Amino acid sequence: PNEVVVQRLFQVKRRRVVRATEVPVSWESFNNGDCFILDLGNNIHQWCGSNSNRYERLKATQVSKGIRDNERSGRARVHVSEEGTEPEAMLQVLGPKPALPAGT
Amino acid sequence: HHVVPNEVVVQRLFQVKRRRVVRATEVPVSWESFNNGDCFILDLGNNIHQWCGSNSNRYERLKATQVSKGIRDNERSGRARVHVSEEGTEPEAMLQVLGPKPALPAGTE
Ligand SMILES: [Ca+2]
Ligand SMILES: [Ca+2]
Ligand code: NA
Ligand code: NA
C-alpha cells in the first residue's frame, strides 16, 4: 500500500482576554508580571509590574479611571506607581513590601 | 430619626492579567486562515513549515517551535524537516499549497 500525507494547518495563538479580578488585599496577591489596582475609596492606586504587558497596563488604566469616574462621580484621585515608587498610602494598607514573585 | 450617617469604604484589590495559555488548533489550509498577529504551522508530511506573523508574540513563537518539533519527533519519528519563514519569505512549497499570497489582516478582529 502507498504512504499518504495529510496536509494540515495549525494556528498558534495566545488568548487575548485581559481580566480584572478581585483578590485578597495583601502583598501576597502581587507579582511583577501583572498590574494591580488598590481601591481605597477617595484614592485609587494603580501599580504595574516591570514584566506586565501593554494590554494589562491599558486595562488597568481603564479600570482605575472607570472606578474614579463611573463609580465615584469623578470624586477620587488615581495614583500611578511602580516597583520602588509605592506611596506611603499603599504601604499603610499593605504593610512593608517584600520581594515579589516574577510572575504567574 | 436624627442620625449621624457614617460612610463605609471597602478597601479592595484587583488583579489585571492577560490569560497566558497559547493554543494550537487545526484550521482550514488556506490563506483565509492566516493573520499577521499569530504563528502558523503548515504540515506537509516530510516538511513542516513554521511561519510567524510580524505582530506575533514570543510565546506564540515558542509554542509554534515546540509544536513543530513535536510533529517532527513524535508523529514523524524524526523523519521530517522544519522550515521557518515569515512575511515576504514564504517558500514555493507554501505557495504551491496555499496559492498566491493575498494581503493578510494585521490581527484577529
Ligand atoms: Ca502578565
Ligand atoms: Ca497573537
Ligand atoms: Na510523512
Ligand atoms: Na523562507
Residue numbers in the entry:
A (entry chain A): 154 to 257
B (entry chain B): 150 to 258
Task: Show passages lifted from the paper.
Gelsolin is the prototype of a large superfamily of proteins, responsible for the assembly, disassembly and scavenging of actin filaments by means of its severing and capping activities. Gelsolin is organized into six homologous domains (G1–G6), sharing the same gelsolin-like fold. Each of these modules hosts at least one calcium-binding site and the presence of calcium induces both subtle local and large global conformational changes. Conversely, the presence of mutations in plasma gelsolin is known to be directly related to a rare form of amyloidosis, hereafter referred as AGel amyloidosis (AGel, OMIM reference number 105120).
